[PDB]
Design a protein around this ligand. Sequence first.
Ligand SMILES: N[C@@H](CCCC[NH3+])C(=O)O
Ligand SMILES: N[C@@H](CCCC[NH3+])C(=O)O
Ligand SMILES: N[C@@H](CCCC[NH3+])C(=O)O
Ligand SMILES: N[C@@H](CCCC[NH3+])C(=O)O
Lengths: 295, 296, 295, 296
Amino acid sequence: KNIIIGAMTALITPFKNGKVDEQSYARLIKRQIENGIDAVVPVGTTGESATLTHEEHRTCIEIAVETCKGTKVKVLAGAGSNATHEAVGLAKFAKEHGADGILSVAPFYNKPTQQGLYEHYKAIAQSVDIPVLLYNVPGRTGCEISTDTIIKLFRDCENIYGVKEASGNIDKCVDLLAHEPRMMLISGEDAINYPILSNGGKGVISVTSNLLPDMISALTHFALDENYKEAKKINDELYNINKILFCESNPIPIKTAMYLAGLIESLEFRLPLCSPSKENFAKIEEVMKKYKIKG
Amino acid sequence: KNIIIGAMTALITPFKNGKVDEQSYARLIKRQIENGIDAVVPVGTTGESATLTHEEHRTCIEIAVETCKGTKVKVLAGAGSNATHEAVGLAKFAKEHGADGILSVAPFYNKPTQQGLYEHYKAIAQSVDIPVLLYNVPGRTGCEISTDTIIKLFRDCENIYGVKEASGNIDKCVDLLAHEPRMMLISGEDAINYPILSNGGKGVISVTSNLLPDMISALTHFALDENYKEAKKINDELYNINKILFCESNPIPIKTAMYLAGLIESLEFRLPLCSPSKENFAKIEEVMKKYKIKGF
Amino acid sequence: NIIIGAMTALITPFKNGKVDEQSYARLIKRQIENGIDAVVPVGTTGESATLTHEEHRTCIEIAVETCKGTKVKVLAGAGSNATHEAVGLAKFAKEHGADGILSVAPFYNKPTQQGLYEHYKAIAQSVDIPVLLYNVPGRTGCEISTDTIIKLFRDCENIYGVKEASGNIDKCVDLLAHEPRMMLISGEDAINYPILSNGGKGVISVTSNLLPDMISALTHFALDENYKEAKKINDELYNINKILFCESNPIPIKTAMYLAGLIESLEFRLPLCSPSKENFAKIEEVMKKYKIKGF
Amino acid sequence: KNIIIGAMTALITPFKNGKVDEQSYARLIKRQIENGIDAVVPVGTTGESATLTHEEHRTCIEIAVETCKGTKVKVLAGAGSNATHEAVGLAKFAKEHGADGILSVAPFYNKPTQQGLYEHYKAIAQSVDIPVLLYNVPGRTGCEISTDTIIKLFRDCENIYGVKEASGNIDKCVDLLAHEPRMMLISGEDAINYPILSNGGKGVISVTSNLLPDMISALTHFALDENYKEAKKINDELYNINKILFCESNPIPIKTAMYLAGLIESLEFRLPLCSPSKENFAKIEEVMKKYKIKGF
Ligand SMILES: N[C@@H](CCCC[NH3+])C(=O)O
Ligand SMILES: N[C@@H](CCCC[NH3+])C(=O)O
Ligand SMILES: N[C@@H](CCCC[NH3+])C(=O)O
Ligand SMILES: N[C@@H](CCCC[NH3+])C(=O)O
């Protein structure tokens, strides 16, 4: 099956005076390209997909597809929804508008059964032909795509090729690849990028890469090159930034970090997201003072 | 402060051929109305708000308002979203179209901070001049509105009057009312309706009441009338059905039970929701046999 | 035959390492002087884990003699994660004048529900005094399931109920809806009233070390079905009830006793120890809200 | 620091007629030595430490010490307790009767604070002069030794050299080795042996090695040799046995498997442990027969 692996970036969606800032967005994607990043994920969790209108969401996917066209870099379009008909709609759009594949989050809030999860993803996979990456983030969704379901879907569906794991559970990671070595396990948690990669994971979808695309890109390629000494080295030194970028909900801290680095104009969120508390603000800028940020 | 309390129902949304069965929807509300229900909650979690379009969502509110108009049964409209701008738009439609107040779920999925939660609700509360009931269901949303935030919202916003608590945390309920006895604590967890009411809760927003509106109605009014022995009696009897209705994700069992009772024509959901396992179907069917289920 | 009502998990006071036995008697007298219906020598609040049998059994004796000739009963701590030990403890408490035993679920070793049944069955059959089960999964690492609690209650005459310390009011509804004959005892102070209002017949309290009159009043107002008054006290008590667990029980309660001049010295036996300076201030501050009894 | 690393086995404690089968114990330890284990852990959790008397506890250690004498195999004695005086008492015997070091579990049930955990272990480490390995298993104890606490103990106490981690938390394993690279991180969770080792872990204390000591020792040695591909392969192969060895509480499945393998005479537990459900019995037999088991 066709895949999208390697060092991938969960793009922040910068805001300017309320509206999506289409210049910085298309610009930041270029900064990711010119820094060793293999793929970009428009409008994921980090891109505030919840606060974006279906039009704005569709716009960002299109921008991402258009800024990358003609490069090595791929676009993994965030197409998740807790309503299957929307997710399909977002899936069909990405395909008909030229994304390489889609990252489809597990339905949040409505807590579907494993059966419902299977049919949800089957419907999405069987309405496009592009690679589909599952996304398991139970802390946010209130639901867990079981290994059984994940593997079931991988086998039943031609274009479902893996899962972005952000469940903090390395046991599940071993479980996945022990019973199903053919799948692409993607790290969805920055602090444990290395352990996932060292167990056969084939890439990451990073938040930290927004700030430090070089460090994250190198880590993954070192790990993929099976240079575990160097990949662990980077993972170890990135531990502090990886943890501090979650002292409050992503993408709050990362945007704050992208702001302090001059990479974006305004520290601007769409409610219910907001700027962090001053304490966590102090903690971020301090940790930032320990790394070399490029622009 | 103006409020909406008593026996309330988280209305299921019946589908027929994929579309909302509006006649059936109106009819189910009538059944709730005539069985002692004080207010109805169109399009909550139980009404599959996640998979309705904004237009269907708005229609269900219209149907609910139209059906309760003339009765003193209030319409507490589900207006929550994980986007403040959506939540405000929904809250404004609810106001403009006759809803007596709204129910606003804590933002799900995007895990806002307590600061973000406060501003999210303040923005909503300032948008309309009708009662706003907070909704805390951390198991679904991935976030918890802390007791302190709840009390701040209640004290800072004139139309925020309470919270539907669905966390299975009785300590929190004790915490809420020990510090702010003026707020309306609403049970959103059927199994423990009585413990919440008996600690000062002033109503329930029930899933069970779709099937047994009379029993839930009587439970709440016994409790509200301080007849705790009779309220507890009913709560104990309802424990079986109260648990079985969550053998899978609400509203999967309740809709199955409604279908089994002949109260809705077809057992249809919108994906990712679907019919329960054949086993749970049999378990629900078996548990129903222990209860007198009022018809239309 | 049962033990219900307002019960106190007695603290075990230390002076220079050894159990201050005069302080123990004075405290127990103080509990009796304030309407407490039963005392629990050597519970978790009594630091059973760090005591020797020489002391575990000294304490029980003192409890028996101090209560000898009053209406106040003695529910001895007699639990262990080893059945042969718990049986020995059960037999001791009996052979030494205890009116009943409190038996915690086996901690650490995580027995099955089958094992939990065979454990308690062997305990109840060893002695002829009533046995109160103790469920505190946050401490033990296991939970006695509702079915297991009910089976034990039905299969053994002297198993008459359970001290519940799981903060799960649903389980309390479950237990009393299916087995309304058992004595559900509250083991979490903050939610004493909601448990009592659902048919609970008593509390085994930490706060009643400090405020025995109020806890005794609460429990008795609820037994008389004056739920209005029981709720008032429960609400007044919430703050002290919560602060008494700002650190692990019995660290805050012993600190409070010390601050109230009720024990000689703030002395724990390791691994327990003094609270942080911060929590010391918190505890001291919270205490001011309350009128505290002397001897 | 004096250390004890490598492939280690949490020894089962076989009972015949209620008493510790001393001869079978030595026979099992001998089998471990022959199949390449680096250390054995007498009377830990798997050793049913909870139900053994002090006489038996000490007896088991001495058997482990005397069997390992004249070999490279070390004895890491289980010597934890949730009372510091008893833990020091246990520690003092283990040191005086041959054990190369002690494994000391975090105080269970009484939940001491981080400050308490520090003073607990400091009192242990400064009362005997043999290596001490911390044991963090919060699911059994109810408390967690924080990363900061572990590093403080490592730095302020000469003979504390690392921690057996059985919390299924790889993030914590990263935090530990990233801030204190001299830490001897030992896997205490068989299913994640490889991921812990691949991050700089220096050993395992295995339940599975009782049954398959060759595979566990091969896994650990491969990982220490930077041969991650082969170490992962084995870990992947062992995943199912590593998981079903916990369908019921350890050491219930492992002892069952050892009995069905003919490695011990009888399947006796001391209460509150007991024989598994007859269905879990067949489950264990099923999984074990999918592996190659060494005799004596
Ligand atoms: N805020 C809603 C709608 C999002 C529409 C697509 N960006 C949600 O998170 O599901
Ligand atoms: N599916 C989106 C939009 C729902 C719109 C109708 N309530 C959500 O769950 O928020
Ligand atoms: N600390 C040991 C011994 C307690 C002795 C008194 N029962 C335990 O809790 O198991
Ligand atoms: N049940 C006690 C007994 C300890 C005796 C020495 N192993 C405990 O686990 O602490």
